[PDB]
Design a protein around this nucleic acid. Structure first.
Lengths: 161, 222, 97, 165
RNA sequence: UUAGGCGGCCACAGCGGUGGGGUUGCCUCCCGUACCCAUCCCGAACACGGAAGAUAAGCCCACCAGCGUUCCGGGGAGUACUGGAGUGCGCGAGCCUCUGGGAAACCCGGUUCGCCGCCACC
RNA sequence: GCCGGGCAGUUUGACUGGGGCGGUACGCGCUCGAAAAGAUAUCGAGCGCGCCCUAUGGCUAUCUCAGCCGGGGACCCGGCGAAGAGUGCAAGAGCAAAAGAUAGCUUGACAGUGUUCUUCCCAACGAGGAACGCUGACGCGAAAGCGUGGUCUAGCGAACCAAUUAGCCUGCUUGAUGCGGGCAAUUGAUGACAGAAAAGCUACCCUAGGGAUAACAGAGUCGUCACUCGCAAGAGCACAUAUCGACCGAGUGGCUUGCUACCUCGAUGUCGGUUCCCUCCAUCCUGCCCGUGCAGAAGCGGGCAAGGGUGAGGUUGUU
RNA sequence: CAACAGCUGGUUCCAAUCGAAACAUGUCGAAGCAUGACCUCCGCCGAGGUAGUCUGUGAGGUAGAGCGACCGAUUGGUCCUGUCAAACUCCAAACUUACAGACGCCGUUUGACGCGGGGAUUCCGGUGCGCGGGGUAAGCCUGUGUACCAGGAGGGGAACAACCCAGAGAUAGGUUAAGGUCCCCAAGUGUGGAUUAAGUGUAAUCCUCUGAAGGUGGUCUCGAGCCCUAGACAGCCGGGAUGUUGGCUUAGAAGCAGCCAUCAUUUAAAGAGUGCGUAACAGCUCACCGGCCGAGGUUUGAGGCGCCCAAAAUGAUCGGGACUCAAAUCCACCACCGAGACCUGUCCGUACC
């Protein structure tokens, strides 16, 4: 799996990309969506590699961002979408414990956000940190740059929104 | 090989067998017992030997239903040279009455015939004897006037198979005559060329071969 | 100048190994009704040739007119209509992936 | 002169003799120096002449910078040692402002389309690291030939590296 | 097919070279022009007719790598080049890092002296 | 009928590194430019067509060259010889039992009517062109089949009017005759080639606009111009470097020139001169110095340095 | 007569949804039109559609490369050897592209895709980047793909259409982006380390920020060669034998223009001499010899900071002040500041239920 957050905005480029930011979802900055690593995937993210952060979050680092920014088809109450507002205690959308268990199945593979407990992407992240890498997107991770992968590189970024 | 910069054309090519740009020629007219990948009433020439084949192509195959090749003649018939036209009228005539109608000849197969009202019965064919056919391709060879290639065609024509060809691009007769000029129909073989080499000093016998042909048109074994 | 043999240069041309006449089999092969066929122009052909623009795209064969098969790119031209005019021979290749 | 809008490649092909005529002859004497024939290649001591730049030296550039080069190679007793090699030829033709084509900078003239520059000179071009013109013999002296090319470079638009044998 | 005919792919099949095979089953070379037919002149070829004689050509079979070609190992080379990103460097030309791809020449060693389809056939 | 700017009305095109002169990139074909689909500009590079052919068309049958060598630069015999000798014409492409050659036959270079593509990528638009059918009638072949002109892409032209081809329709109450009007189609021109019947001057000029576009000045630029630096071939009797100093390379200035066609055409007053102020170097003299191919004298070259100084007349509007 | 103009100017209330074209074909046409592309509105239709990616089946000859593969250029030698191509190709990408399936996204009350109809505006464009063609070049001319300006606010860049962040309902709290934290000015006179002495520099990009083929045993860092405890450098200090000016040559030629020879003697050692030098000598030097303590020495390449090739016009400049174990530069790093972006409360509009 991967987590995608679009650090760079789409000032105007590129057009083929930006198309494939949307379609992921995430039509904004600092938004975040979970993608399964598969073909018909991996192609798109690679295309949008310079735009966004990327990588496996650790789970229990994905639980953190589910609870804070979570779901609901329609943004509304039960805003926290905690375990209670996840798998149906009673009748309702369900799946598992409605917590880390949720971001357990997700991390391995399916189910997807909307598929179970049909509340969909995207994550709406705050974007803070002391700062993100060096300001301005650059070549990549091995340089001042938020670019690319690392399990516990997207952990910090994912953390502190 | 070479640097492989070049590509070589061969298939049948390389060493010659078939031609191309011919043998494609033949084929379009779907002929053979049935639809053919390549069909003919092949005529080959060998020193001291003439061969007639006949058959539609296969993916791998190029089968032949019935063959001639004076050599077998005389099965019945007689011992003489086989490298002459007479005795290359006989075959290609003997093949006819083998390929020509025995195993099967022109497009005749079990089941409904190819689209078109066509029925074939024993005896003269109804609705025209016209449907019998094969195209005869000399292989690599040279078209000449009365040439054995053509001659092979002449018998193995009046053998029932009907092949296109052009008259006046044959030996006439004489070299290979008809017994009687008023009736085209007859089995006819002549070897006049050699005959009259001497007058009838001795040796050659044209008379013997008419003998052969007599046997050919008739109820004979294989 | 302007004409069918416009700037083509390579697209039309077939070189060294495959030069001369081509096999009959391709142009004899029959396709029937909606069959997706690619279009191209094999060089060494002098008939049953489409234009030059539009060569390379697939179209769906439809009925045959004269000795030539309606096919051509039945398919769309650019992002557009399947406005199709097809007059291609079997000589140009058929088949689908 | 000066060579400025001459040796920077901001154009593309030709030379093409078909296309062009009235090319000036090169003023670059033979590109075969020293004793030829015998393989000089058997030698101690090696080479030089590396461009370290982009391109297009004119024949005006090479022909007095190369025999200038040879001149102080004469030290090795006329006909006795080394062979000098030049690499690339001045094929490449350049044209200069003949007011009819376009406007502004050269290879543009007056009007639009029209006079391409009229033929005036030819220059070979080179890459970042190519050997402009090399060859050596046994260590005749410390390296007279190395001294050669000192002078050889210093009449090339590029900064040439001596490069050790 | 202990030798054939028609092909597909169209050099892995090309170039060159060694060895083996038949005599009446095949392919030829071969023998010979009365005929059909033929050479701006020649039965050379084309065409026809035929088996006295051969395997020497061709052809078929086995094989050789020197050249050409194909593919592969290892080296060159993760080099040259490059899609995406960077308050990384440099006066600048230009370079670098991260990410995703990735060559050619040439060298050394193997591979390749066709593969496949239909038909007929001691 | 002829003469007839004496007089009247008009026209006298477009493109175009402003305009004009030159040219046409004004209709059309090929290679490249063109960035490996398609499309793609310039007064972009190379170069062609506005015909020619009754065979140089169509079909069928049959199918060895340049050149070299040897034997008697013509010709005859032999050998070598995959192609260096074709296909009307540009370029590019196609072609070998052929699309090329030779021989024979033949008129499909036919009439009629379509489908489609092109013209005009995408994406509408005519003439024209092409591909592929059918109906009818032929040609050649044994037959499949080929032939809708010349292997493919240039060789083209509206409406009105006339002439021409075959049959038919029709002309004002009516019949006959004459002479007309029409349906389909062929030929005749518009090359500024999707078609007006068409020469110039204006400094006597006028209007509408344009900085969409020139002259003058320009802020940007710095090829040009001025000056410098690096390297130092060479010359200077010997001696690179007292002095002179090429080739090549790197710069600085913004005094010349050019470019920008960027600024202004509801207007930024021309050249030269004059008068009056300030400045630049990169110093001509003067001060203080270094070198010398510095005896001295007179110089030559270099350094610091801008305090001060650095004119009068003859020709020419002249600078 | 209120002449006509394709030319300049002007054309007066609020708000909400969508939102261009500066291109193609024809035109006595290029300061204009028409028809297409493109914008909008309305009616119809009915279930799929395809801006992204992956795979499959196809199209391709540009980059590069190469030419004992055509072609045409282009060296030398007695087969070796030296070079090239916009109008070359035995090869050959990235990549663009037709079609299909898959995932994604989208559509069936927001009706897509598409069909028919009404209304346009528009056919002076421009800039950045990539690829270009012309030209010495241009804030040049002319293409192409794309994003932007035009018609786009707000934050940054000293100022500044298109450079960076960023695409914007009102109001509010919060956190960041670009960029910045010595002062002017919010936030550091931040940490570990090193370079720089030129005020280099404090200048991403660029008409705009120049600098190409002056000097520095100031100091730091890195590399390479050679010499050393058989005692180097100083390494440092001191010294620079007889035949003989070797023979020849030459005006001269005496160790040192050149040719030949390079012996012998006396020696602790000393070449018929390593370089400088003279007209030739002389003279200096090595080469060569003696002494001296004891450990590194010397030659050279590169980089960092600082110091003292490179000329312009009213008053110098990195935005300014001013800064040097930095407030410069490079390698790392920590904490902050800082938008209308992102998060968050309420409200408004619009669409839909």
């Amino acid at each position: 799996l991967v987590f995608v957050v679009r650090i760079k905005g789409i000032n105007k480029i590129p057009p083929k990309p930006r198309k494939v930011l949307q379609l992921l979802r995430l039509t904004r900055i600092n938004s975040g969506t979970f993608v399964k690593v598969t073909k018909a995937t991996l192609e798109l993210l690679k295309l949008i590699e310079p735009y966004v952060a990327y990588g496996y979050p650790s789970y229990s680092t994905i639980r953190q961002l589910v609870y804070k920014r979570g779901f609901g088809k329609i943004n509304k109450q039960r805003v926290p979408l905690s375990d209670n507002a996840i798998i149906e205690a009673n009748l309702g959308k369900y799946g598992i414990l409605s917590i880390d268990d949720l971001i357990h199945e997700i991390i391995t593979v399916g189910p997807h956000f909307k598929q179970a407990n049909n509340f969909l992407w995207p994550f709406k992240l705050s974007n803070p940190s002391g700062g993100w890498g060096v300001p301005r997107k650059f070549k990549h991770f091995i340089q001042g740059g938020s670019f690319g992968n690392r399990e516990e590189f997207i952990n910090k970024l994912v953390k502190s929104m | 090989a070479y640097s492989s910069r070049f590509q070589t054309p061969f298939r049948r090519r390389r060493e010659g067998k078939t031609d191309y740009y011919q043998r494609k020629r033949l084929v379009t007219q779907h002929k053979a017992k049935y639809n053919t990948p390549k069909y003919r009433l092949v005529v080959r020439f060998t020193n001291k030997d003439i061969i007639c084949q006949i058959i539609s192509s296969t993916i791998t195959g190029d089968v032949v239903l019935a063959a001639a090749y004076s050599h077998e003649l005389p099965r019945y018939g007689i011992t003489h040279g086989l490298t002459n036209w007479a005795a290359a009228y006989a075959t290609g005539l003997l093949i006819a009455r083998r390929t020509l109608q025995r195993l099967g000849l022109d497009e005749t197969y079990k089941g409904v015939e190819e689209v078109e009202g066509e029925y074939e019965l024993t005896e003269a064919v109804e609705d025209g004897p016209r449907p019998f056919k094969v195209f005869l391709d000399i292989g690599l060879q040279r078209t000449t006037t009365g040439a054995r290639v053509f001659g092979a065609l002449k018998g193995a024509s009046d053998g029932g198979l009907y092949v296109p060809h052009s008259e006046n691009r044959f030996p006439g007769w004489d070299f290979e005559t008809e017994e009687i000029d008023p009736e085209l129909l007859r089995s006819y073989i002549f070897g006049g060329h050699v005959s009259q080499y001497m007058e009838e000093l001795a040796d050659d016998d044209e008379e013997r071969f008419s003998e052969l042909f007599k046997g050919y048109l008739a109820d004979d074994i294989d | 100048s302007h004409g069918y043999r416009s700037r083509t240069r390579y697209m039309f041309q077939r070189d060294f190994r495959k030069h001369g006449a081509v096999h009959l089999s391709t142009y004899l092969k029959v396709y029937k009704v909606g069959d997706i066929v690619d279009i191209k122009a094999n060089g060494s052909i002098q008939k049953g040739m489409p234009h030059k623009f539009y060569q390379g795209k697939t179209g769906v064969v439809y009925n045959v007119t004269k000795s030539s098969v309606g096919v051509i790119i039945n398919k769309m031209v650019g992002n557009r209509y399947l406005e199709k005019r097809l007059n291609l021979r079997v000589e140009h290749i058929k088949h689908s992936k | 002169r000066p060579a400025r809008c001459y040796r920077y490649q901001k154009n593309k092909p030709y030379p093409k003799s078909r296309y062009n005529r009235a090319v000036p002859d090169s003023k670059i004497r033979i590109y075969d120096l020293g004793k030829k024939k015998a393989t000089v290649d058997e030698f101690p001591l090696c080479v030089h002449l590396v461009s370290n730049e982009l391109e297009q030296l004119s024949s005006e550039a090479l022909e007095a910078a190369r025999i200038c080069a040879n001149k102080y190679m004469t030290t090795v007793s006329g006909r006795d040692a080394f062979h000098l090699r030049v690499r690339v030829h001045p094929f490449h033709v350049l044209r200069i402002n003949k007011m009819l084509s376009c406007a502004g900078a050269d290879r543009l003239q007056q009007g639009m389309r029209g006079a391409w520059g009229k033929p005036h000179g030819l220059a070979a071009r080179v890459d970042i690291g190519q050997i402009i013109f090399s060859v050596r013999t046994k260590d005749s002296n410390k390296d007279v030939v190395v001294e050669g090319l000192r002078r050889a470079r210093y009449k090339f638009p590029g900064q040439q590296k001596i490069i050790l044998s």
